[PDB]
Amino acid sequence: MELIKGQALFLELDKKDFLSLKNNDKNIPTFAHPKNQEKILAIFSLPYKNPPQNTKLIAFYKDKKEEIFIKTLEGNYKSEKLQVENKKIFPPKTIQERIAKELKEANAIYSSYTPKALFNGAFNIPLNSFITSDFGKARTFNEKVASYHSGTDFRAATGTPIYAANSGVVKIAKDRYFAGNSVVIDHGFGIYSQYYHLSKIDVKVGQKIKKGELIGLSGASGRVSGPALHFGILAGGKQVDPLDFVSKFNAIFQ
Ligand SMILES: [Zn+2]
């Protein structure tokens, strides 16, 4: 019941007489424990940027309240001190609008909660190469965090086939300002995977997709630093450390 910022954890709770799980009147959804039928699960995530120092949750049962305290740990993320901090960019109106529009779309998707499992066992990595840029690489103008790498980058020459980390429904399959050519998949229970900077999109919004199924070709779209696959996980409303999430998720749903 310590959690590093930008990570998810799976809380286990007794199923019997459970009524709700709350965080200051935010209801946290619950789903079945796959291997213990007397338990349920909930995903709790702390944001990378500007998280609470401590979190208290209440699980309300028919005959009892149960408090749950989680301290925010800082972790050991690569960070470096920005030296400029003009901090305010001044983009053209046409770009501000497209960003704004795409941000409203994405927030509508990531806020929605499909209350069933759309995945199929464990997550696989979307590509069998290696990490060239880690999740959580931060740029700080003290005393906090100016920007951070909200996913992890795999080495990929332009045109490398990218496969869905798990089964789900495609919710985004288009070119967006920061993500380039983007695929976003709903796996259920508020878990979304993100495949950014693609050179080709091979799926369509609404499509049901299987684990291991081709979703496009890596590229360098929307990416300044050249070709790579940006892979993200959003869970519990927040961007979380994707390889961390996958190992925790797979430890439960294998
Ligand atoms: Zn990235």
CA 179 to ligand 1 center in whole angstroms? 9
Q: How many CA atoms lie within 13 A of 247 on its CB side?
A: 4
Give dist(CA 168, CA 109) in Å, integer. Answer: 14
Give dist(CA 110, CA 118) in Å, integer. Answer: 15
CA 230 to ligand 1 center in whole angstroms? 4
CA 57 to ligand 1 center in whole angstroms? 32
CA 54 to ligand 1 center in whole angstroms? 28
Under a CB-based contact definition with an 8 Å cutoff, are residues 127 and 218 in contact? yes
Resolution in units of Å: 2.4
CB atoms within 10 A of CB 114: 17
Q: Please state how this structure was obtained.
A: X-ray
Spacing of C-alpha 228 from chain mean position: 18
Candidates 194, 206, 174; CA nearest to 234 is 194
CA 215 to ligand 1 center in whole angstroms? 18
The answer for residues whose C-beta is within 8 angstroms of residue 123's C-beta and 6 or more apart is 165, 166, 193, 211, 246, 249, 250
Give dist(CA 212, CA 229) in Å, integer. Answer: 16
CA 196 to ligand 1 center in whole angstroms? 8
CA 77 to ligand 1 center in whole angstroms? 15
CA 142 to ligand 1 center in whole angstroms? 23
The tokens describing 123, both together, are 């997550």
CA 150 to ligand 1 center in whole angstroms? 7
Amino acid, res. 114: T
CA 240 to ligand 1 center in whole angstroms? 13
CA 25 to ligand 1 center in whole angstroms? 33
H/E segment holding residue 138: strand 138-140
The answer for residues whose C-beta is within 8 angstroms of residue 237's C-beta and 6 or more apart is 45, 110, 111, 190
Q: Backbone dihedral region of 190: left (phi > 0), alpha (psi from -120 to 50 degrees) or beta?
A: left
H/E segment holding residue 252: helix 242-253
Give dist(CA 45, CA 43) in Å, integer. Answer: 7
Amino acid, res. 92: P
- What's the DSSP call for residue 116? S
CB atoms within 10 A of CB 72: 17
Domain carrying residue 201: 79-253
The tokens describing 96, both together, are 């501000």
CA 86 to ligand 1 center in whole angstroms? 22
CATH assignment of the domain containing 209: 2.70.70.10
